């Protein structure tokens, strides 16, 4: 054989060289660094009003406004400071799995099992919120979506694909393929020039938004990936899985850097988020709790106990003042 | 301590709270039914017979039903079945016409879920005009050696029904409602109405401790 032999020998030799030139793990270089202690955080605000499981939640760029979507087919925009409900958008499909808040603050994006990314305009002259656009073309369910700008958004789907759209035209500018399983989460880089996405094929990968080419792929995993997020500098990313483990990869070494697992943890991770410093990795588990992990020591730095059902979504403000957590118990909680 | 504008914002928030409560009430009187089954199982037949994700809203005897069909999802990765908790029932469709083993494994899968241990299942064998003529070609042993009963309609159909019932691994919490009567007769929705009524009554009873 030549094509099969070529593929096998390539993969083997690249991976062997990567392993050989690997110097040390994340923990090996930070052993001298002192820990953070116990991250004891209190529920400062509790957002009541959602009457079903909360699936997605995204902070606004002002670090004061929130948007959350519930299984009840409702997208609530909250004023976290006072617990004032700013907006209540009735979604067209009640099966919504992702939320995004436009960096400018004029738009919000949502969607789910309807295979459509709906974009709603907040700053209208009529005093209400309307459906600005609907992006269609994905075949599998809508896993995640993130605004690049006021007119350019990036999406992941369960078709093993991602899509870069142009909101004005409504057509998908680029289609990113290469996954073999359902793509469950995407994170946008701070400079909005790349992104990373994990799929049900138990693999993650870095995709360039401009060239539409598959820049890199990362493996070393047992189960599917349900959550992914960038380090605040866009030089790494953490993934959460049904394996009951969270893994931190670097996009330059091309190798997994650190593992975030504990023996008593038996269920998967639903959501992943980073501290403003990237010093605390917050992970929502199926154990009805949210764990805070020392991103450099891999230890559990705390637990955001206080949710009576699965913690579905996490989020950290842009200023790092508070953490929003949404669970299946129909409550969002802000912790500080 | 509120400013003149914060008071109006709080009034708006309270109005939004009222709207959310009054729409959640409206959403809590509606019977949510998941629709499952293999291909060519009558799913398309049932959705038309019934009075990405495809939602069918229909009213029967004052009960408003939202039937959710997720057959369009081409990935069998069950990454969204947990989204269908709280649904009153799962309508699973099978055809008497080894695709039967495929239906059996699907039924075992749906029953085994930790997310559906409390939700009854409504299994249908709806059509009855093509379920008899093809039983004479050969007994129920082309891929099922174990059957040793009369190779007639009622005997073999009842045996298959009982064998699908047998996959219920814990009959203590949930129940199975089976259907046979021809699809031509307008009884398919009526049976669904009775099954959901029974499910809701038992849920109410199991809530006040009268279970």
């Amino acid at each position, epitope marked *: 054989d030549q094509l099969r032999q070529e593929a096998e020998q390539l993969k083997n030799q690249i991976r062997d060289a990567r392993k050989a030139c690997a110097d040390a793990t994340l923990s090996q270089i930070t052993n001298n660094i002192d820990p953070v202690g116990r991250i004891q955080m209190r529920t400062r605000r509790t957002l009541r009003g959602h009457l079903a499981k909360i699936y997605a939640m995204h902070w606004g760029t002002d670090s004061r406004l929130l948007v959350s979507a519930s299984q009840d087919g409702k997208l609530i925009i909250w004023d976290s400071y006072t617990t*004032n409900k700013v907006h209540a958008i009735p979604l067209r499909s009640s099966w919504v799995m992702t939320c995004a808040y436009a960096p400018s603050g004029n738009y919000v994006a949502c969607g789910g099992l309807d295979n459509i990314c709906s974009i709603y305009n907040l700053k209208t*002259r009529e005093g209400n919120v309307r459906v600005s656009r609907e992006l269609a073309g994905h075949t599998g369910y809508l896993s995640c979506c993130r605004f690049l700008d006021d007119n350019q958004i990036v999406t992941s789907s369960g078709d093993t694909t991602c899509a870069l759209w142009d909101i004005e035209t409504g057509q998908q500018t680029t289609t990113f393929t290469g996954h073999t399983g359902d793509v469950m989460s995407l994170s946008l880089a701070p400079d909005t020039r790349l992104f990373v996405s994990g799929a049900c094929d138990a693999s993650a990968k870095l995709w360039d938004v401009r060239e539409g080419m598959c820049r890199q792929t990362f493996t070393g995993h047992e189960s599917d990936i349900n959550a992914i997020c960038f380090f605040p500098n866009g030089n790494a990313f953490a993934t959460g899985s049904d394996d009951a483990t969270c893994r931190l990869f670097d996009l330059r070494a091309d190798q997994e850097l650190m593992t975030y697992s504990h023996d008593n943890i038996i269920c998967g991770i639903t959501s992943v988020s980073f501290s403003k410093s990237g010093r605390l990795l917050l992970a929502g588990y199926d154990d009805f709790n949210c764990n805070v992990w020392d991103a450099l020591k891999a230890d559990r730095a705390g637990v955001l106990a206080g949710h009576d059902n699965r913690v579905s979504c996490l989020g950290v403000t842009d200023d790092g003042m508070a953490v929003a957590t949404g669970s299946w118990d129909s409550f969002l909680k802000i912790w500080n | *301590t509120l*400013s*003149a*504008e914060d008071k*109006a914002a709080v*009034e*708006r928030s309270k*109005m939004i709270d009222r709207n959310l409560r009054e729409d959640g009430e409206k959403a809590a009187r509606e019977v949510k039914l998941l629709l499952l089954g293999a291909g060519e199982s009558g799913k398309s037949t049932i959705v038309k017979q019934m009075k990405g994700i495809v939602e069918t809203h229909f009213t029967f005897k004052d009960l408003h039903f939202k039937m959710f069909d997720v057959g369009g999802q081409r990935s069998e990765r069950k990454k969204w079945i947990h989204c269908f908790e709280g649904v009153t029932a799962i309508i699973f469709c099978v055809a008497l016409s080894n695709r039967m083993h495929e239906s059996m494994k699907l039924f075992d899968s749906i029953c085994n879920n930790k997310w559906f241990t409390d939700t009854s299942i409504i299994l249908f064998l709806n059509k009855k005009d093509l379920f008899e003529e093809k039983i004479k070609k050969s007994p129920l042993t082309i891929c099922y050696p174990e059957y040793a009963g009369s190779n007639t309609y009622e005997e073999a159909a009842a045996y298959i029904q009982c064998q699908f019932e047998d996959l219920n691994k814990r009959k203590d919490t949930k129940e199975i409602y089976t259907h046979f009567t021809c699809a031509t007769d307008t009884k398919n929705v009526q049976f669904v109405f009775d099954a959901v009524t029974d499910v809701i009554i038992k849920n109410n009873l199991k809530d006040c401790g009268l279970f």
Partner: single-chain antibody
Framework: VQLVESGGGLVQPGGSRKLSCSASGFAFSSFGMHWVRQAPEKGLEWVAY????????YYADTVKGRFTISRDDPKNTLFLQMTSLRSEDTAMYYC??????????????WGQGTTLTVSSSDIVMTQATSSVPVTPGESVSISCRSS???????????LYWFLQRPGQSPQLLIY???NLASGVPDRFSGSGSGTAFTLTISRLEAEDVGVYYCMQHLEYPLTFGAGTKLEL
């Protein structure tokens, strides 16, 4: 957006009338409404307010207990029923929309007004001047002073800035502090601190002539200023 008033005319003292306001082009039910008035070449004066949902109705001390403000959300209509009309109730009355939520502009749109003629504690804000000559292209700086500190604990300094052009209804320019409204040229800017407040205009144009008004929203009743005129 369109707010058209009606019901004005000449009325003898001791009579009663009902000013009406028809709305078209926005989510009226989610908007509170203000009734304002301007006496002949004397200035703007707040009349009343009704919030979204009719849950809060406020009246001006000058006409508090005399007058009533009524909402009709299904018909998108506002009413001001005036019972006893003295010789001081002669003015052109404006219908204004106002929505309150984090970041909103609560006086974006004013109506065209309707005229009424009649036969023959509160924060005080003063406008330092009433007429200022200027030529196009020369920057201008209007200013006004207030009694208390409009800066609330929220960090919001609830001082507004409207401009009334010759022969047309007032137009919002700033809704808290330099926060330019929608559709206003970027040249207009606002600023101030506590009591002294200023409005700056760079590259003045021919459409910028008129009367500048500074109002406060920290506490009711709402109090306007005298009105600083710009000459050319």
């Amino acid at each position: 957006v369109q707010l058209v008033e009606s019901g004005g005319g000449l009325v003898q003292p001791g009579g009663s009338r009902k000013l009406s306001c028809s709305a078209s082009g926005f989510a009226f039910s989610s908007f509170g409404m203000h009734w304002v008035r301007q006496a002949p070449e004397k200035g703007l004066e707040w009349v009343a307010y009704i919030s979204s949902g009719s849950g809060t109705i406020y009246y001006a001390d000058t006409v508090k207990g005399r007058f009533t403000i009524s909402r009709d959300d299904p018909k998108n209509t506002l009413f001001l029923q005036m019972t006893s009309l003295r010789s001081e109730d002669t003015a052109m009355y404006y219908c204004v929309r106002s929505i309150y939520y984090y970041g909103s502009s609560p006086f974006d749109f004013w109506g065209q007004g309707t005229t009424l003629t009649v036969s023959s504690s509160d924060i005080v804000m003063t406008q330092a001047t009433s007429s200022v000559p200027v030529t196009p292209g020369e920057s201008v700086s209007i200013s006004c002073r207030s009694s208390k500190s409009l800066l609330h604990s929220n960090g919001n300094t609830y001082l507004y800035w409207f401009l009334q052009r010759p022969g047309q209804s007032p137009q919002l320019l700033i809704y808290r502090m330099s926060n330019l409204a929608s559709g206003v040229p970027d040249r207009f800017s606002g600023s101030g601190s506590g009591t002294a407040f200023t409005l700056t205009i760079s590259r003045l144009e021919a459409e910028d002539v008129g009367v500048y008004y500074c109002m406060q929203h920290l506490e009711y009743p709402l109090t306007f200023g005298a009105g600083t005129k710009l000459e050319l």
